[PDB]
Structure formats: C-alpha cells, structure tokens
Amino acid sequence: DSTASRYASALADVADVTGTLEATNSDVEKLIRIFSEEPVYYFFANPVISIDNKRSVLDEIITTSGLQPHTANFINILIDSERINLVKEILNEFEDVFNKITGTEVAVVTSVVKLENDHLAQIAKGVQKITGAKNVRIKTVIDPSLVAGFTIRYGNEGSKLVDMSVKKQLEEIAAQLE
Amino acid sequence: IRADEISKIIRERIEGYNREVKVVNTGTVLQVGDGIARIHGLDEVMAGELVEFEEGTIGIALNLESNNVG
Amino acid sequence: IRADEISKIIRERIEGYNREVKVVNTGTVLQVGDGIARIHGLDEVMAGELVEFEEGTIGIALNLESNNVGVVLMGDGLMIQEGSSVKATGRIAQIPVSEAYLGRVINALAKPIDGRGEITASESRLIESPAPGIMSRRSVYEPLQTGLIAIDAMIPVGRGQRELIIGDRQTGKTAVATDTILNQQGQNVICVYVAIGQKASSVAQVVTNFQERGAMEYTIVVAETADSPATLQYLAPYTGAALAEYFMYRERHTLIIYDDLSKQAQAYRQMSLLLRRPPGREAYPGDVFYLHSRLLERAAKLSSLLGEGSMTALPIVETQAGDVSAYIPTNVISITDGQIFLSADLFNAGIRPAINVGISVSRVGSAAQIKAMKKVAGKLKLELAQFAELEAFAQFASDLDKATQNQLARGQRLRELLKQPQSAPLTVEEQVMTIYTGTNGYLDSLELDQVRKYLVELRTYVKTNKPEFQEIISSTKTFTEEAEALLKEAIQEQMERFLLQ
Amino acid sequence: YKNETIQFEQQKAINQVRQRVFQQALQGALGTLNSCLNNELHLRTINANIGMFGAMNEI
Amino acid sequence: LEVEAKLAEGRKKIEVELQEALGSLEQQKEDTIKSLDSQISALSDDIVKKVLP
Amino acid sequence: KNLGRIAQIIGPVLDVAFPPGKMPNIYNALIVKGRDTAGQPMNVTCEVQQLLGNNRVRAVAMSATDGLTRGMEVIDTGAPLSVPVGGATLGRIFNVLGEPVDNLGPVDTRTTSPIHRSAPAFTQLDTKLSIFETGIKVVDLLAPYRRGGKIGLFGGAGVGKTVLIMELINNIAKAHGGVSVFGGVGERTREGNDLYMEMKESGVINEQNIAESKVALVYGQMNEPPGARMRVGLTALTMAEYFRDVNEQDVLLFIDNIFRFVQAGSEVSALLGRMPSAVGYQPTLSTEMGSLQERITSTKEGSITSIQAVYVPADDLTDPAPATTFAHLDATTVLSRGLAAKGIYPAVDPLDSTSTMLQPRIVGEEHYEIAQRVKETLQRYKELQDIIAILGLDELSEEDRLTVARARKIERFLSQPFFVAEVFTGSPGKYVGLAETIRGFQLILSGELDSLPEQAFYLVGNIDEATAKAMNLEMESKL
Amino acid sequence: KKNLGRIAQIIGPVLDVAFPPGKMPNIYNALIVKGRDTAGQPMNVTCEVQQLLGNNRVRAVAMSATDGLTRGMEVIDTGAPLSVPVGGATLGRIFNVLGEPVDNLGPVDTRTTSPIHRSAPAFTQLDTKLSIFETGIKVVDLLAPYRRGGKIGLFGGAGVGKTVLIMELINNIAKAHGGVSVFGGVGERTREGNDLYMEMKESGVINEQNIAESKVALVYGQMNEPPGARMRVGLTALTMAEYFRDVNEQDVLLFIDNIFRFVQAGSEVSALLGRMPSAVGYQPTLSTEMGSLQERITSTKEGSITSIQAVYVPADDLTDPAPATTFAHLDATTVLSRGLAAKGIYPAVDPLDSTSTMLQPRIVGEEHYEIAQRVKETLQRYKELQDIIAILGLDELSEEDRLTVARARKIERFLSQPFFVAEVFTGSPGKYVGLAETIRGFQLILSGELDSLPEQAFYLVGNIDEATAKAMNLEMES
C-alpha cells in the first residue's frame, strides 16, 4: 500500500473504468522502456531543471510515441506532484497492479529443464484451480541449482512457492538428523 | 506518505487535470477520525472558516494543507 | 561406537521421509539491519511464525505491513544475502517439553546449553498460551515455603501467588531467589530459574551452587547470555512460562524465577525500537505492560477441576537508586501479587534479607501461609510496622513512656529475630518456634543482642529434646496447646541453659 | 554427571558421524545428478512434475 | 578442615578419572567415526535411490 | 460486500482495507473469524477508531494478535458493537464483546445495547444531591459519599484500594436492593477471581440459582489486549447504563481500574498513528474520561452510584490522568504510602481526600465541626512532623505537643479493621456506625481520652472497644 | 577479489555503499575503501558494514577520518570480518584500531591473525572457581574483593581518579602475578595513554629491545578517534585477550578504560544509522553491545581473563543505562563517589555500593567476611546519620552514636590509601598493604585500640602501624 502502489492503483482504476486497459498496459510497457535510459529519467528526476521545460518534454514524448491520453495526463499529474522521481518503482509496480486488477496471476515456475509447454498449461490449470485467478501468467527460467524438480513460485510477488528439486534433499537431510 | 495519497482523488485528478485551475466550490473528506478530519477541496477556505459537514455535524478548519484541509 | 551400527538408522530416517505437498509462504528478504529483517513479499505469514532463512538463524515475525514484515533474528544472522528465500515454518513458536529437562541449562530455543545431551520431547507448547481462566481458578489457599524467615513471617508467599521481589542491584535478589529455590527439597516443587540477560559466569555460579545443593536435579535454568540477541533475551521468559505450564497442567505445582525482568523489558525495547514501532514513555515501548501482563498472568494456581497445581512466580525487576517510579517497576507492581523490597540500607545494615515491611507487602495474606504461624503471629506484621515508625519516632528519645519503652524493646528484639545467617533455610516449624518466641515475650527480659544465640540454642534444644513438636504440628499445620506446651517447656530449659550461660 | 557427559559426547559423535555420512550422501547425490541425464532424468523430472501437479490440484 | 581437604582430594582424583574416561570415550568415538566408510557409500547410494524416483 | 483484507497488523492494531463499495463507520465491530493456529474456527473481534483513507481503516482488536494473518477476510457487523444486557445478564461473568466467560451456560443474548452511546445531558441528570453512609469510619466521617454520586479511589502502588472495594462492596451490596455491577477493567485476574469467590461465598452471586444476583460481574483481563481493555469499561458502563435507563433502578458500579483503561487507550494510540501527549498518555485522555464520567451520571430517570479505583502511577497527583480524573470525580479518596507504611488502613490521608457532600448543612453542623477539628489538628501534625524529626517532640512546644499526640491517636483510631482484611490483620473487622465515629472523635479531639495509650486506638472499630483495648493494655502493663 | 564497486552515500562518519546486485557482503564483516587523498590513494579508509540497506546497498561504519572520499569511490570488499594481528606480534607493540603498529615500529607479522569479533564462549567454557587475588589497595581488599578471571568494574564520574586508580592497579599487577597483561584504551586521553606507556617503558614490564618479551599488549584507542574506531578498539583488545586465553591459555590482565566512551561511540553512530533513540540519548542496542563486550570476556577453563573495566558514569548518574547495564554485567562494582574526592580522600570510594559477590564467607574466610561486614554496617549507619547530622549539628546524638560516627570516620580516613604512582601528583610516596593489614587495622579500629589518635592520625597512610607512627609524630609536634 505504498505511494507507488496506490498511484499505480489510481492509473489502473482509471484505465479500468475508461476501458483503456490493455492500451495503458502496452503504454506502460513502452513507458518503462523509455524510462530504462537514465538520461531522460534523470532529466525528470532532477528537481533543479525547470518544470515547464519538463512538462513540454513529457508532452512532446507523449505526442511523438503516440501514447494514451490517460497515462499522459497521469504522468503530467506525477511531474506536477513531484513524484516523478519514483517512476521506476511506480511503473514496475504498476504492471503488477494492472495484473492484479486484471486478475492475471504471474507465477514464476523455474526449474532445471525447460518443461513441456503442455505441462506448463497443466500446472497453469492446477494453479488457476487453487487460486481462482483470471490468468496465470506462467513464467519459466532454467535454474541450475535446482536439481530436477518443478519449482513454482506464485502469490502476489514470491509468497507461495513449492519445489521438488533441492527441497527433497532438504527434507531428507533435515529430518534425518532428528 | 504524501498528502491525499488516496488514488480516488488522484483518479479524479488524472481524469480531469486538463486545465490549469483549482477546485474551490466544495470538497470531500480524505481522512477522518477521533473527531478530526483531513478533507479535500473548497480551496478558498478562510482561516477558521466554518465547514458545513456531511451529516451536518459541522466543524472549524485550522489545518489547510495543499491537497488536504484539516 | 560409531559408523558400525547407525547405518540402519540412517536408512530408517531416509526411507519413510515425507516428500510432502507442502505449499509454504516464502519471502525474499529485503532489509536486514541490526538484528531485524524487514522482508519483502511473504504475504500469508502469521505474526509469530518462526521464519527460516538461508542460515538457520530463524526469526519471529512480530510486526507486518502492507509491503514488509517486521521480523527479528533469534540468533543473530551475521550473513544473510539480500533476496534470500526466507520462508516461514508455518507453526507458531511451539516449544518441546518433557520432565527430562530437570537439570539441563536450556536455551530459549528449547536447546540444551547444559552439555548433557539433547532431550526427547513430545508436546509443542505454544509461546503465547493465554492465562488460565477466570472462573476456572481457585484462590491461593495453600502455603508455599520461603526458607527465609521474614518473608514467611510477615509477607507470605503462596503456591500460585506471584510475589514480586524488587530492589536495587547487588542486594541479594538472586541470592534470595536461589535460597527459596533450594528451600524446595521435599515439597514436590519444580523451580524454573529463568536467568535473563546477565553474566554467564553468574549463571554458572548459581548452577554450581545448585550442583552443591542438589537442587539442580529438578530445577530448569533457562540461561540468557548477555550476548544473546535481544529477541532471544526477551523471548526466554515466555519459554520458561510455557515450560512451567507443561508441569502445572499435569498436576505438578511449580515455581518460577525470572531473573531479571528489567533486562527483558530493555531487550524487548531494543527490538521494538529497531522495528521502528514507536516508543511510549521513558523511551520504552508502551506495551512492556502488555508483555509482562501476558507473562505473569500465565502464572497462577490451578483448581481441582484442571489439576489444582500452581505456578507461583518470582519475577525480579531491577530498580536503580531505590526508585519505584521507574517505568517497569511501575508496571509490574500493578500486575504482581504484592511486592517485597531489598533496600540497600537494610542489606548493608545487617538485615539480610532486607525486606522492610514498611514498603514491603504481600497482597494475598495469611490464607497462603500456614495456620500455625497464622494463629501465632498474624498481627506481627502490623506490630513491626508500628515498631518501625515508633523507632523512627524514638529518635526523640529523652523520656520515653514505659509502655512505649516495652513496645520499642519488644519490636527491637523482634527485628533481631528477623536476622538470619547466609543460606540457612530454617524449617517452617522452626519459623513457628522463633515466631512464638518473639510473640510470647520470653526474649523480652533476655539479652537483646544475643537473641541469635538464644535462637540457635533454642532450635538445637527443641530439635533434639522435643522433635515430636515439629512433626505433630507439621502434620496438623495448627498451633495447638501441645505445641504451646512443648514450646514453653524447651523455652524454660534453654533460657536456663543460656542464662547459665 | 561426568558419566552422563560421556554418553552426551557419544550421542554428539553419533550425530557427527551421521553428518559426515550425510555429506557422503550429498556427494553421492551430486554424483547421481551428474549421472542424471539432461533428457532422461529431465523426462523423469517432467513426469514427477506432472504427478506433483496432480497432487497440487488435489492440494 | 580434615574432612573438607579429604573430600577435595577425592574430588580431584575423581576429576582425573573423569578426564581419563572422557578422553578414552572421545578417542574411541573418533576412531569408530573415521572407521566404516563403506556403510557411508552404501547409505549414500540408498539416499540416491530414495531421492531419485 | 462487506469483506475486506487486513493490510497491516502491528500489535493489536490492525490496518483493515476494504473495497470502495463499503468503508464502514467508526466504532463498528469487525470480526475476523474462522482461523487460528490449530485451523480452529477462532474469531477475533476488532473495533475501528481511525480510518486511514483509500477505503482502509486501522482497528483495535479485543482479543490477541495471534491467529490472524495479513490478507484475511473480515466481517463488519454494519454497526457499533452491542453488549448483551438484561437481568438475564446478571450473575455470569462475560467478555468485553459480551461472551459469557463463566464457561457454564451462556446468558440469553436477546437485548443488546450498543456499547458506544450518547452521554446523558444534565437536563436528564438527577441534580438531587444526597448523602451516603457506607460504614467505613474515615470515609463516612470525612469523605461522605453521595448516594447518587461518583466515587473515586485514588490509590497508590497497590496499597488498600482493591481491598477497600471488596470491603465496601461487602458492606453495601446487601444494603442497596437495586442492581449492582462490578466492572473488572484490566483488573488483576486472580484478585478479580478472589472477589468472584467472595460473591459466591456471601451469596450475592447466589451460585446455586442466578438472575436473582443483584450483582453482575463483567471482567477484562490485564493479559487481554489493550483493544479489549480500552472498551471493557464501556461494556460495564453500558450494562449499568441499561440498568439505569431501561431498568432505571439504583445501580452500583465498582470499576477497577480506570487507569488501566487509560493506559490501554494510550497504548493503542501510540500504535495507531497518533502523537504522544504529556507524560504517560494519549492525547485523547480528556475525551476518554469525558465519555466515561459523562455516561456514569445519576439520571432523573434512574439513579446511579459508581465507585471506581484510580491507580496513579508513581503515587502522585500531578500525573495527567489523575489531573483529569480528579476533575471528573466528586467523592475522592486518596490513599497514602506513608499511612500504609505505618499500617494505618485505609491508608487515606484525610488531607487530600474530600467530597462535595461535606457541606455543614448537609452533614449536620456538629458532624461538620467534628470533621473540621480533625482535619485541623491532623494537618497541623502533618506540618509539624518534619520539625519533630529534627528537633524532638519533647522540645516541640506544649500547645502543639498535645495536638500532635492527639491527632496521632486520631489517625490510628480511624484505622479500622475490615471483615475481609482479617486475613491480613488477625482480628475480624467491624462495620462502624457514624454516630459511634463522631462520638469517639468528639472524645479524642476534645481531649477526653487523652489518658488512653495511643496503640489502644490501633485498628479498633469503636471507641468503647478502644477503651476496652485500653484497659487490656493497662492490664498487660501490670502483667 | 570480492565485489568491487561504489560507495553511493557518505554521511559524515557513517557511509552507505552500493554494490553488484548479485552478492552483497556479510553483515559485521569489514571491507576497505581505496578512495583518494592529497598524495596517493591510500587504503587508509578501512570500513566496516553495519546494515545492508536495500537496492544492493549496504550502510556501513567508517574506521578512520573520512573526509576527502566521495560517492563512487572504488570500494573493495575484503569479504572476511576485520582481521587483526595477534600473537607475540602484539607483545609490547602499541598498535591501533585495525591492528597496524602505530608505535613507530615494524609492521608486525601477519602470520597469525584473527577476525575482530566472534561468538560468545560457552556455558561450559566458563570456569568454576571463584578466584580471588588481592591488589594492595586496602579499601578494595577490605570490602570489594576482586573476582580474578571475572569482571572488575570501575565506576565514577570524571575527575575522580579512576584512570589514576587503574594506573595504580596496573602499577601493582604489571610486575605482580598474571601472564600477558593486555591494556586496552577505549577512548583514552592519548597523552595519558603514552604516559602510562612510558611508565611501562621506565618500569620495564614492556621491552625497549626484544619487545616480543613483554607480556604486555597495549592496544590503545585514543579519544581523538572517529566513532567507528572508538566503537571497535574494545573488540580489538578483547580479541587479543581471548587469543591469549585460548592460545597462550594464559591468565590475561585486561585493563580497559573506559567503555562508556565505547558505547557512546555506539550511540553516536546509531544516531546517524537512523536507528531510533533510546533512554536518555543512547543507542537502542547498548544492552546487546555491552552484552557482547562482556560475554566475550570470561575466565575460561584455562584462561582466567581478569578484566579491569572502567565506566565513565556521566555526571554521576547511577540510574543512567550505561552504568545500569554494566554493573549488572560485572562482578566487582567500584563506584568512586565524587564527594569523597571533594572531601579529599584519594582514592574516593564509597563502601556502600562498591561491592562484590566475592565478599562471601565461603570465599574470603568467614573472618574476612565479618571484617568487611563490621566495617560496612558501621559506615552505612554513618551515612544514615550523616544526612541528619549535617543539618542540626554534632552533639544531638547519643554517646553511642557519637562514638560510632567517630569510628566510622576513623575507617573512612583509614582507607585513604596513599598511592605509589601518585607521589608525582600529590607528593607522598605511596604505600603497599596486604591481608595482615586487612585484618589488623580493622581490628584495632573496631576493638578500640586506636581510639584516641585524631582523624589525621590514620589519614593518607595505608599501614595501621604507619598510622601509629604518624600518630606518634603528630603528637610529638605540639
């Protein structure tokens, strides 16, 4: 319930009531793509440089990159209310707030081997059963330290997490010495 | 941490910024409890101007911070 | 014997393991600084769950926000990488319990720090098991013995009653605690000397004295190194409380010695401060009241419906410069069953123990002490209070009234009865003997400074000549005319023996 | 008490030998991980993940 | 003084006996723990079979 | 819905969130339920004080913080908490939320008054002033209560206040045929238990058959959260309120301690995002005492007489909670560590303790002269005593040397034993009549019984018994 | 070798360093910073981590003067906790907060080094014997016996002869018993540090040549030092001491003075760490840090680390927490009341609170126990009469109480131990006393053998026979 989280919530809520849901989604994707470079991020983050020049630059980038007027108006409010210093975590949490309001449950299931995509859909259906979420945005990455087992991680960010790779060995080496 | 960090007023804000003006007519609560309340709006409010509350339980305002009047 | 048989037990522990479907809450640790771990993620974590790190220095989750969770480091985690998968344990700070603890120096994570070997234990006692119920419990109607004279004389302790020792430093608080522990040698009393936040050399000294006195066969010392993390240093009294609950819940009445509790408040203060939970007054967090409330209210007397045992408590709190208006000795006096003081003046002035009953008080009274001492000297507490005032009044000693002269020399000799040597725990029947010797004015005519010698002569004389007295009264708890007769008889005899000479 | 300290050391040494045997178990497990094929043991991992997925839906 | 010094001497002798018995037990335990490395390989293989399904 | 999440839990403060469809009002009972450590259907009740924006609210819980975990459901009852009140709600001991904690049969929960309510305006307050005698010597002499008033036990560090309440309840619960109620508010639980045992003993609970019990006990633990303790007084007050308006009988309240309630309010207010105040407390102390001491008022509809224990920490008066509690009291009894140290009980310095009902015309203009003479010689002695402690009584001049011994007898004479305190004293107490009191004091202050030894006045109920003990003391001066 | 990178923030003493996101260093480990200077970019900036603070950033404590460095300096993670030279390399060498020899001698051999801090020693690795040795200062030897291997607390305010009492104690036990004698100076007046260093050089317990024959390891930390340095020198000195008690397996004499300055450095660094304050001003963690510095002192199964710690009681406030932790944490409290020094006794030690658990009959002999008793009862009674005798004069007492006041002031001036090192300060070449004195001066005072010689006739003389000879001299001069 941070400031970045609640500003993200305001943006996702105006997108949800205005029907600009996925438009603002792709828009914040390209927006954080633009904020990836620290020159322009520092240009906005510096409070020394003049606010009218900053506003002109923002509206300029808005017109050029062809963005939603909602996120345009939003980041104008952000530079006005000075919280443009925080846009990194603002948008980085806004994607997840959008995922929340769209119910899409991002679940990073790492493992040691690139699992069969049917089994990805299988555990996707299983975790949608255990969650009730709209989507389960299945995410995978090869982890070598994980020995063999499936290693899910779901919930809000990384809260709920099941493994079978080293956790099996951890079970054995824990419970043996007791 | 900021004042009026409530995202409902900010939803209204990002809907209807597109002007350079105020909100001076009336306002809404932002925060309330223990007989005090931090409220939004009615920007011209005199120092100690009485406040016509909802449910008529009127009060006087002494904190009048930027986005939030107490 | 090693590596020659244990392979089959290795197979037994391996084969038949869980391979569970345990979905767990797991947190990526964000902000560890100075004994705390403000951890990112970790949503469904019960406040009070132990949280397993990379390390093994587990931690209790005390506070929790919308983003972070205030988690402490029971065991200081000296190396924890940021973003480490710090999952909870699910269970809530449970404590294993057995009668095989009876002697092992045990750490707050239930761990034997005795060197005696690990303990098998079955139950999982909660760390916040609440107080016993209001209707469920009986009044403290039964005596529990001090071994020290003046406390059982005026300000009685009772089984289930939670008297509070208090006083300045270096005035024998831990000493009178251990004395009233190893008083309990045949009273079926478990003692739990929970040592908190002091010298491990001191706790080694007290377990040395316990090994001398044999009392470490049944007592359980929860040590707390001063280097132990302050989360552990405040946690340990809750562990001792639940461990004594383990024995009181069967039938077995017990006693506990927190030692001290002021360091518990200080360590808990440190944890709450690093947790940024804001301080109340005197820079403490406000709810040290609540902490000690939950502690001491877990110490009471059972009734017959659930086991009629007791958990009489002795939480020593430390007060600097003889104050009472220090914040923790202001909370604990409201939440204790009366308080006893050890003034530095009374200790260094020979009254050892130093319980000046002018400020000392036991707020359940005679119903928690024996009927014999009741019928003898219920009144002696207030008599000695008047003697204390009048002896302060007898500073103006020019022409004292003859009656107040009798009263002052009387209470003088009474106060001299309340002198006792170092670690000489008198029989409670002997306390009845000396209390009747005082209350019946035999010593009034006698020598005023040789009353200690009169008493040791008298107690040897009765313990030899008429030991039937102490057993008949200990079987009846009642000061009868037989007790009177044997008493005054040996009184005439030993009064003769010490008059000549 | 000193006699009991000997049995304390005995149980501690039994646990220490058990810990060294668990280190040897970690060694043999790493050897089996090396001799756990990137396709065969991967297929075993996928099948075990599918069975664990059925267990998860049951959970 | 007599009984106290006698018991102190007896306690010193018993402490010597405890030190000797403890050294003997610890040396025998370390010897037997270094011993029997084959059961370690066998139990490691059994753990491999338990973990790998 | 109204189902929300609990975003932050820090101590017994619970930051509950809610969807923007519903954000409930203040003071409303919220109940997270169905969860515990054992998978139990354990519920926790939590009421709301501050609602911190974004449709979220920080609440205080009336049961322990353990059990419930952030991101959990919560069912607000759409209403402020309501306490089961009625004559069926006598006898049994019950919770702050009203659940019978006597562990036998629950009372019939059908008439539940809301726990937070309006305070009676003074147009409803019974302005009828009245006099009360309660049989305890120093009180019914010098701090005579109003049968209708508010009665304060300004106690020190656990000295004579609770035993005073036990004695006084024992003496007046039978006396007042109307309803009575003890409110155990943060009381020490084993001494509330001892009180409950004494009510079982003296049959005021009538343990074999209840709801004829004109006494009604409600208790809240020390070990309970301060969220419980900061409303248990409101629970007891509402039970008395129901009996004062609906039943509109003579109602008797004995809450202990009010400062427990104050400390619990301070305790949660530090947590629930609010500043501190002057030493001790919350900045809402005055309004807390306002709610209480405006709701405990003898009404023109129905009388009430609430006594209440006030433990001051550090045993003083400049402390802010007694600095407003005196301002909200009318029958003040202030105990003293000094008079407890000299064993004199109740250890009230009569200097500090006064009452509005000590007017001469309303106590009897000779009783008032008794009271004035005792207060005069007593205060002069309490002045003189340090000069004594440096220059000797025998030096300290005769026209005051008589008065020092006189008032020195006076205070110990008005130390009188209690029928329960005999466990602490040795002799069973006495229920003293005020005529006997003023008679004995008209002997002492005049200087008729200046022949008696002073300790003949020690711990004696009546002055004729003091003469009897005096003859016994003289007899033993011979023997 | 480990993570290189950049300091992102420096805030006076404290510093916040960012790092590669992969591996942050340990907590409590050290790391140097290269940084810059005027001439050369020396590794003078040693540093030590305190709090990993988000965003792959660690908030860390400095050890030296920390101007001239900036954000973005080339920080070097050394990974390990702060190592420090140990061994015979210590012996005699006056080395500094990180172990480097600042005695203008050779850089000591790093072949044996040890980390700065470690775990607490074990419940079993505590000793058992209540060890007692005397010193030669009679008030101590009367009523505050010294748990050797335990902790010996020196309390008092400022300007009350506490450092001077430590100089006298080390002046005795430097050539008295005990093996290696590790003095540490936590926040010492550095001119006085080199002063007693020169006293070691002149007294020869330390060695000019062949310095590895010293049994003395004077690792001072001067008062001038930055708060990290003052915060760490205690851990350095105790690392030396535990090194010797585990490797020399020696009874180590552990003069340290004064650890209040250490915990004040802790308070000062916490105030920039942003940890919320505590009682009256200090760090919230004073309890645990004093617990560290105490519990890592023990008398081992073989090394009785006798520690003689001073605590600067600030403004003579006993209820301050910086005392209130320590004299729970130690054995022999010795508070030095300033008003006694105002009267003019040196040392200025009350009997009432200056105490020990060594004062037990079954340790000191019941005879010496009751000796100390019969002193203490009388002097406590004298205080109880003092606070009402000062008002309203002398003779309003009894004959008994008048005689008791006389005899109590007899013991009082009788405990005026003339100090052997204080000759250069006052003029009197001090005296040495022992257990025959400890019994006999008490015995003559309490029996009433010496009962007519005036209050000057046992003033500033240790030996009671010396008091008799002084009485003879002053009676002769009339």
Ligand SMILES: Nc1ncnc2c1ncn2[C@@H]1O[C@H](COP(=O)(O)OP(=O)(O)OP(=O)(O)O)[C@@H](O)[C@H]1O
């Ligand atoms: N009856 C007694 N006779 C003589 N000495 C006593 C008696 N009771 C206690 N003492 C002494 O009190 C001294 C201090 O003991 P203790 O440590 O319990 O005091 P304390 O105030 O608890 O100190 P701390 O709080 O630092 O532990 C001991 O040396 C002990 O000898």
Ligand SMILES: Nc1ncnc2c1ncn2[C@@H]1O[C@H](COP(=O)(O)OP(=O)(O)OP(=O)(O)O)[C@@H](O)[C@H]1O
């Ligand atoms: N025992 C003593 N003998 C002679 N002179 C003394 C003694 N104690 C104090 N003085 C005088 O008082 C001055 C300062 O007192 P003192 O040296 O005791 O404080 P200190 O030792 O510096 O205290 P600390 O070391 O705790 O800071 C000394 O310079 C000396 O002149």
Ligand SMILES: Nc1ncnc2c1ncn2[C@@H]1O[C@H](COP(=O)(O)OP(=O)(O)O)[C@@H](O)[C@H]1O
């Ligand atoms: N002179 C006295 N008369 C009666 N009780 C006394 C006296 N002195 C001390 N007490 C004790 O004080 C206790 C009552 O203290 P009180 O303030 O009433 O309750 P609490 O201590 O719980 O606040 C009694 O239990 C009794 O043992």
